[PDB]
Design a protein around this ligand. Structure first.
Ligand SMILES: CCCCCCCCCCCCCCCC(=O)O
Ligand SMILES: CCCCCCCCCCCCCCCC(=O)O
Lengths: 129, 129
């Protein structure tokens, strides 16, 4: 129903392989690969604000689903794309050669990004406030 | 007694002036100044683990009070210093020309970094799980 909350990373797969594939420096990969931080989502109807802890970087993006928006990626590149809401619990978008699906089930968010034959998956749990 | 917990930044003063004085790139100052992230502290006796969201960077440091420790600063530089316990609710250290005081008051942490005539102050509030 609502994505709003603070979410702590529980596990992830293929962080190193994905970050290498997009061109992150090996130094940033090693610094960030073991960080289990907190991301925050604020949802207001179709409007979303994301404060994402991704490795050693914090990325803050904001978008209304269905509208074109500029979003900062891991590389510092700003891509223009549209994020769609599928049902009430799935955010879907594509940018460059990456497909991203953010799914909320109960208190768990599973983020799956696919780049070629690499599936980068992040599993995070809502902090119960 | 215990600093352990997750803390969300509530307010801060003089971020830009402090970051300019330590030589942070201007582009990192502008994108980091409005981020209100979550920092985590794990305390075990005199041993501390810090996962700090500072602007658009995540910094992870460890140390034991009273023992010389190597710590990453906001610029990525590593410094060797000693962190002291003043009372039971203040952590205090000096490195380069900066004095840092971390004070716990119930659910509020206040961090005061002083550099010459600039006082950079962060107030964070414990996330109640
Ligand atoms: C699509 C632009 C964002 C680029 C950042 C990529 C890093 C992984 C993104 C996952 C964020 C999804 C929110 C759930 C919480 C989390 O996994 O931190
Ligand atoms: C001693 C250098 C550590 C890193 C320097 C980054 C500047 C911000 C330091 C604030 C750390 C205090 C932790 C309490 C919670 C917080 O304010 O995030």
């Amino acid at each position: 129903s609502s994505f709003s909350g603070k979410y702590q990373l529980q596990s992830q797969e293929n962080f190193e392989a994905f970050m290498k594939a997009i061109g992150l420096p090996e130094e940033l990969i090693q610094k960030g690969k073991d960080i289990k931080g907190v991301s925050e989502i604020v949802q207001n109807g179709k409007h979303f604000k994301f404060t994402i802890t991704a490795g050693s970087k914090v990325i803050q993006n904001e978008f209304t689903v269905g509208e074109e928006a500029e979003m900062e990626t891991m590389t510092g590149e700003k891509v223009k794309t549209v994020v769609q809401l599928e049902g009430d619990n799935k955010l879907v978008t594509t940018f460059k050669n990456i497909k991203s699906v953010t799914e909320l089930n109960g208190d768990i968010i599973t983020n799956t990004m696919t780049l070629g034959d690499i599936v980068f998956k992040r599993i995070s749990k809502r902090i119960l406030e």
